[PDB]
């Protein structure tokens, strides 16, 4: 297994797959609650998607053609799946943390669940303001998430290779800072152009609601490096058992609040601001 | 390997990769026949694709721009690859069932071969009638297939974890029933609108051929849960050796018959029904 | 591990992951140089992409909407990542050749790094001439690369299964010959139509530069089967230590020269040839 040491590493193997769970009761309860709320948000958003009329309220299957409107749905849907298998683990009492086979887009690994969620989510949110460079942000966050997965892989491995985890941490943090700066800049410029093009709208309160939602949604990603630093992978100011509840509340804020905000926006928007958004998505 | 038991599980490991095959002569012959017919259907469909003129029969490389017309080709092509490696296993006499490394889109695992085939196939068939919600059905079937792969992973594992296989079976069956119901509903509504918009067509017999093909193609997926139930993973009314021939005949019906039906449709369709399909794909 | 033999195979396992490196100083230096030049080319191309004006030189974020112009960027970007982890291995002195977990699009395996690079690269280059059958070439090269990965998997395995490596070699070479022939034919026909439609251009020297670039770029892929034949996987006229430098120079020619050629083309093209390319992309 390892040279010079009789200890063996169970990460990425079926041997660690059959090990008993290292979680406690509160982690299982948090997983259950997160799965329940993800499922009910997915059901509610799908119910709204089935009864989703167009802006003119006469087009029947508007979501059937403008399928990107349902895009967040899929992400939220996958989030439910991203936890459902863990619930199965919570049923069986066996180890599930970074063990077993590696499959893209599943919650069997800590950061690999975000492969199909995070780039689509950021693409959808910047598409809602018709911001340019749609593919670029998704590619950047995909690369950062892959770096995070590989850093977590080095974290559990041989302690002689512990130094690479900090290097990949620095890599991911540098690209995340760059991505956050560029997305904040483009969002600020785009919404400034929208505001200077927002004359005689009649939805100023709705405009305030949407600007508050998008600014909070842009600034929410400050959780990831703080959470990584406070867990034992970084400075270790918290223990492992309280990391799972943190990840649950963070990705609930990321997904369910996003779905609720989009649902509340779609029941209050009007058509002239819509056509001004299409006008904005030109230059 | 496993606590309390000296037995070891060879699934997902190189140890089970080097094991001798568990198949018999008839399974090898069925694999050979299925690979041969898949290869000849792929060759025939590619030959038709090279000599594929437009509806006006003057556009030379119509398939070169409307590349989605070749889409089924790719699926059928991958199906050939999906069996070709198994033929190599049939050459070497070593174990190939759910062993070795896991790679997306290959036939080394029982259900993982359908990753690149089934969503593209369903998208192509519902696109042929210009049905809405194109991405949604593909995402649903992708999630169901991933659930099936993971259920098959639990099936071979530790018998103390056998209960999760039935839970994932219920999950996959519930979402498959939902998908089948919604796709049947949308197909029925879409073709009802086509029929009430099909006046003075001149291709009523061709219309009967295409409706028979699409209805049979919509109802063919009843094979999957019945096949899973009759094999030892479910009720076990059949043995393992006769499961491979069942999967061969089922995916041949799924792919080669689809290609033959599309080829026969493209040599008999006319242009006014074509433009009425574009008219249908509006509301 | 293996029946009848006490030897064990370290491929695809964490046991071979923790093994010491089999590389020497020159391989590490070549990896460092290749990573450095890939990083600087990515930085330069990103700097050009940020300051990328439209053909009329008044559209500010032309790349923000015509995002496919940045497509090669992403490939080159991934190439940097495709080597960066190897640099980490070169830091740690542990084995990295075809060991550890298998992840799509990474350089941990010899041919798996090209999953996200080669089809996008060929799609971008044939899109630059507006050639038809865009998806088909990408699918063909994806299948060939997957076959190469699996052949390399058989190469390291049990010597009783060495015969399958030659079969997959023949498969990959046959499909590569077919792909090369068809891409050469379509490129020749397309550029012949461009030349017979190139009247009063004013950029004949620029036309010569671009034709030389595209012909060299079309003929560069002759490196892959020659490199595979000369390494010990084939005829073995060279040793393992000199294969890494060959792969470095080959993929540098594939990626950095492509980026430099595209950058030099974008600083010299004019608008009438541009609109003639859009006219060409019709029939």
Author numbering:
A (entry chain C), B (entry chain A), C (entry chain B): 3 to 285
Cite, word for word, the article reporting this structure.
ChRmine is a homotrimer with a central pore between subunits, unlike all other channelrhodopsins of known structure which are homodimers.
We purified apo-ChRmine from cells grown without addition of all-trans retinal, reconstituted it into lipid nanodiscs, and determined its structure to 4.1 Å resolution. The lower resolution of the apo structure is due in part to fewer particles and anisotropy of the reconstruction due to preferred particle orientation and potentially an increase in overall ChRmine flexibility. The apo-ChRmine structure (consisting of residues 3–285) was modeled by combining portions de novo built (into well-defined regions) with docked portions of the ATR-bound structure (into less well-defined regions) prior to structure refinement. The structures are similar overall (r.m.s.d. = 0.8 Å); no major rearrangements in the overall fold are observed. However, subtle conformational changes are focused to the intracellular halves of TM1, TM5, TM6, and TM7, which bow out toward the membrane ~0.5 Å, 1 Å, 2 Å, and 1 Å, respectively. The overall effect is to expand the retinal binding pocket and loosen packing between TM6 and its neighboring helices TM5 and TM7 on the membrane facing sides. These changes may facilitate loading apo-ChRmine with retinal.
